[PDB]
Amino acid sequence: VAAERLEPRVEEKDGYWILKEQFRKGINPQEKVKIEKEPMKLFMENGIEELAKIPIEEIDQSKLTKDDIDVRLKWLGLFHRRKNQYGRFMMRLKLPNGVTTSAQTRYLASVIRKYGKEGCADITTRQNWQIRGVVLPDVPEILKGLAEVGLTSLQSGMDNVRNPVGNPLAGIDPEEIVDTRPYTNLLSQFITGNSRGNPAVSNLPRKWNPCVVGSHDLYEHPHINDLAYMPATKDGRFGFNLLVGGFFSAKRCDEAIPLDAWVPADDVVPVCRAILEAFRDLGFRGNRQKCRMMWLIDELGVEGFRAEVEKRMPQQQLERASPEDLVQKQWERRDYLGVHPQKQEGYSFIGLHIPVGRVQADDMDELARLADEYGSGEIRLTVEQNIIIPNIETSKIEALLKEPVLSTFSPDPPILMKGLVACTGNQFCGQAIIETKARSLKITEEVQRQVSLTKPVRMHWTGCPNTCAQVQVADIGFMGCLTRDKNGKTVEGADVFLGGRIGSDSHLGEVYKKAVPCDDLVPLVVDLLVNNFGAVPR
Numbered sequence: 320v321a322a323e324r325l326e327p328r329v330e331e332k333d334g335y336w337i338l339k340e341q342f343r344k345g346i347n348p349q350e351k352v353k354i355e356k357e358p359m360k361l362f363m364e365n366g367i368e369e370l371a372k373i374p375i376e377e378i379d380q381s382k383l384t385k386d387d388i389d390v391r392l393k394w395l396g397l398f399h400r401r402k403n404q405y406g407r408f409m410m411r412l413k414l415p416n417g418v419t420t421s422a423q424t425r426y427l428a429s430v431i432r433k434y435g436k437e438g439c440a441d442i443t444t445r446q447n448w449q450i451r452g453v454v455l456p457d458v459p460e461i462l463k464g465l466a467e468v469g470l471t472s473l474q475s476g477m478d479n480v481r482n483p484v485g486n487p488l489a490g491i492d493p494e495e496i497v498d499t500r501p502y503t504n505l506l507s508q509f510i511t512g513n514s515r516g517n518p519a520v521s522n523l524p525r526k527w528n529p530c531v532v533g534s535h536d537l538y539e540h541p542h543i544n545d546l547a548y549m550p551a552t553k554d555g556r557f558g559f560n561l562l563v564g565g566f567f568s569a570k571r572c573d574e575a576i577p578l579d580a581w582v583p584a585d586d587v588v589p590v591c592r593a594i595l596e597a598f599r600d601l602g603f604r605g606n607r608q609k610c611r612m613m614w615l616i617d618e619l620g621v622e623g624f625r626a627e628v629e630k631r632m633p634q635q636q637l638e639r640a641s642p643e644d645l646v647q648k649q650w651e652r653r654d655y656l657g658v659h660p661q662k663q664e665g666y667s668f669i670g671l672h673i674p675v676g677r678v679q680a681d682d683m684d685e686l687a688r689l690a691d692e693y694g695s696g697e698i699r700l701t702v703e704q705n706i707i708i709p710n711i712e713t714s715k716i717e718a719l720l721k722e723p724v725l726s727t728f729s730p731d732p733p734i735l736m737k738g739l740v741a742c743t744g745n746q747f748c749g750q751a752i753i754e755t756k757a758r759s760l761k762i763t764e765e766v767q768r769q770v771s772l773t774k775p776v777r778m779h780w781t782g783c784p785n786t787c788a789q790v791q792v793a794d795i796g797f798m799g800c801l802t803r804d805k806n807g808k809t810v811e812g813a814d815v816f817l818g819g820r821i822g823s824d825s826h827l828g829e830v831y832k833k834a835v836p837c838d839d840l841v842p843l844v845v846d847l848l849v850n851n852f853g854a855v856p857r
């Protein structure tokens with residue numbers, strides 16, 4: 320790699336970071352959108368106030384404003400559902416470590432309730448909330464309401480640092496390695512500039528996923544993050560070994576690799592900043608399929624990339640990885656659904672199944688009520704799109720288990736439901752090839768009616784090759800496609816994936832059988848379960 324390749328390609332100008340004049344040749348259309356107008360201005364200079372007043376039909380008549388609502392608004396966490404729910408916006412939060420309060424949950428419920436049949440909410444595969452039904456004129460008030468309850472939606476889409484994932488059992492599990500909440504909180508504060516916006520990290524070449532590990536179970540999926548912090552003691556000091564570059568895409572899926580770097584626990588934010596600065600400064604900005612950070616690491620080599628991180632650290636110090644980390648490889652991933660004792664004597668948490676992560680306003684209010692009556696007003700989200708209510712006095716559990724709402728959001732659903740994960744799909748997502756959430760529930764119910772099993776088989780349904788529902792981590796994955804029935808008629812189908820393993824012995828699954836009509840999946844899946852996962856026909 321020539322020295323010229325290492326010249327930073329962006330510069331700070333008037334509070335924002337912009338591509339230098341000589342580094343604009345050959346850039347992709349999204350890079351052009353970012354040059355034409357700085358997306359962060361919609362929040363940081365309150366551009367949204369006047370934009371929200373323009374009728375959407377008028378907005379669509381000019382490129383600048385159409386790009387504002389379809390692209391730039393994703394820096395404020397607002398996602399126009401142009402194709403499938405025209406004129407409505409999904410809104411996505413920052414929710415480090417998946418932690419919410421009952422007051423926040425009620426606020427979110429109040430927003431979606433206004434929109435009737437156009438509103439609902441979802442738990443995401445980054446243990447985050449999305450709300451639906453939002454209309455542009457309401458955006459300024461919703462932004463204010465979020466701030467009022469201590470939430471932000473900043474920088475949650477497009478070329479930004481995505482939700483910091485941590486251990487859903489942080490602070491409460493007897494078996495935790497280290498409480499991840501202080502670290503994910505710090506990362507979210509850094510990323511969003513304490514909810515004011517942080518332009519230094521909002522003009523990346525592409526999305527970028529961080530997580531902090533605190534569990535032997537590796538609930539945080541460090542192998543598929545751009546930056547994963549692996550807890551490790553080095554020379555008698557607590558800190559983290561760093562994994563970099565994990566990502567999924569239509570073109571390529573790759574597990575994170577060692578940076579060969581250890582940082583003291585206090586250097587979590589400094590090293591996140593250094594890595595993001597290197598990616599921002601040096602990453603390719605052409606073909607969008609080749610802009611994730613792993614492509615930079617491959618171009619420079621991991622050592623070349625490491626040197627770029629090192630030079631951006633305070634005092635330019637970046638120690639080599641600790642020979643061992645704290646994660647025990649002898650481990651069986653633990654079910655968190657149901658009632659479990661906390662490390663705090665006399666307290667339990669309860670994991671509740673949320674079928675395919677989908678809730679309505681009334682459901683959110685009920686869950687918030689349970690969290691207040693039984694817990695400490697806290698609701699935790701998981702990356703399997705479930706919930707945990709922590710800090711419940713154990714003597715209250717008997718009463719809790721009788722609550723009517725638990726017949727719907729159950730502490731002990733059938734085993735295949737416990738592991739079921741499904742993305743948005745074509746109900747709302749414009750890229751989706753198939754419907755996912757209703758279909759996945761229907762097929763899973765039919766499969767479980769036919770077989771019993773004891774292995775915790777994890778089934779993931781994703782609607783298109785973007786693989787937001789991570790089919791490559793599943794025991795059995797389903798990637799949406801169009802295919803043909805016996806008569807040659809167009810039907811919805813799935814490409815079926817096998818081989819995904821999570822935890823310390825992680826492995827990426829691969830296509831097993833392409834183009835299976837969705838109507839033909841039940842017998843295929845039943846046989847796979849019997850033949851490979853010890854399932855027994857009923």
Ligand code: SRM
Nearest residue numbers: 409443444445447566567568742743747748749785786787
């Ligand atoms: C909601 C969520 C799926 C879910 O049902 O849980 C989701 C939904 C969308 N993803 Fe995703 N992604 C979700 C996690 C993921 C993950 C999983 C993860 O982070 O562990 C991946 C794969 C891992 C990765 O990125 O390395 C993922 C890979 C993508 C990609 C492909 C990335 C790439 O490099 O090619 C896109 C398309 C893009 O960004 O160009 C994308 C694009 C989208 C959009 C924003 C597309 C669009 O605007 O319609 C989807 C919004 C649909 C909607 O209305 O909900 N989504 N997306 C997840 C929100 C996470 C969050 O809270 O921030």
Ligand code: SF4
Nearest residue numbers: 742748751782783787
């Ligand atoms: S995997 Fe495809 S269909 Fe599913 S939410 Fe992501 S972009 Fe939409």
Ligand SMILES: O=N[O-]
Nearest residue numbers: 475476477526787
């Ligand atoms: O929002 N999925 O990158």
Ligand SMILES: [Cl-]
Nearest residue numbers: 393476477478
């Ligand atoms: Cl996006």
Ligand SMILES: [Cl-]
Nearest residue numbers: 400401402749
């Ligand atoms: Cl769309």
Ligand SMILES: [K+]
Nearest residue numbers: 673676703704
């Ligand atoms: K779920």
